[PDB]
Amino acid sequence: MNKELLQLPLFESASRGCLRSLSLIIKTSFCAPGEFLIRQGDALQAIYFVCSGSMEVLKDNTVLAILGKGDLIGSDSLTKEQVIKTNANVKALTYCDLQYISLKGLREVLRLYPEYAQKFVSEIQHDLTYNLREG
């Protein structure tokens, strides 16, 4: 009993073959305490998942987003696939490990898996923790 990998049901619910697909384009992102991950207007191409630690986006003198372990970063509507840029600033409060991948990378691999893939864009909401919108 513990934090299962199904944080991303797309692959965890796929044959290791898909995970091998994602792995073909798997990306790893890490943040440190007070570490700045994004700066207002940054380009959003990948989505990240936090497994442990603490992070938040700072804007308007206040944290525009407050998330912790298991949280998710990125806007929803992965089916609309559009240009999105974080208008706020991202700063990891406490050392946290984050896993991310290029939306193009995940969809290609999943492309190999059309049923689970087409479902991925819609299945994401099952994990969507924090929706980051542009501007």
Side-chain angles (χ1 to χ4, degrees):
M1 209 301 184
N2 57 229
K3 282 177 166 43
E4 284 260 305
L5 236 315
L6 85 192
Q7 61 224 50
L8 283 179
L10 30 109
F11 86 76
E12 221 315 293
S13 204
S15 230
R16 247 74 188 172
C18 236
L19 189 50
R20 151 283 236 156
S21 80
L22 249 58
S23 146
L24 246 290
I25 200 115
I26 265 287
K27 322 291 235 199
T28 114
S29 31
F30 33 94
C31 313
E35 206 258 80
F36 313 85
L37 212 64
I38 85 87
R39 175 61 142 264
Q40 166 146 64
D42 279 13
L44 203 114
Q45 295 141 314
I47 163 160
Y48 327 57
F49 225 109
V50 130
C51 165
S52 119
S54 356
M55 30 139 42
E56 46 59 37
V57 311
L58 220 304
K59 168 64 69 53
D60 229 51
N61 338 133
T62 313
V63 254
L64 232 87
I66 327 263
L67 21 71
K69 316 195 227 195
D71 76 66
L72 199 73
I73 167 58
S75 6
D76 206 21
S77 88
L78 246 75
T79 338
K80 189 177 147 146
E81 296 202 24
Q82 229 57 75
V83 324
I84 295 161
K85 29 164 65 29
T86 307
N87 216 48
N89 285 23
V90 163
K91 185 166 84 187
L93 253 47
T94 345
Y95 9 68
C96 86
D97 219 274
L98 320 87
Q99 317 116 30
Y100 74 155
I101 126 281
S102 65
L103 218 303
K104 318 195 186 270
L106 175 142
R107 173 60 129 193
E108 209 287 318
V109 282
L110 238 53
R111 209 174 174 192
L112 224 73
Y113 256 65
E115 290 118 79
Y116 271 74
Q118 291 309 266
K119 254 156 147 37
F120 119 79
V121 300
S122 181
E123 196 81 6
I124 219 200
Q125 22 62 278
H126 176 82
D127 293 289
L128 183 106
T129 277
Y130 206 98
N131 85 270
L132 223 298
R133 319 212 54 180
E134 37 143 271

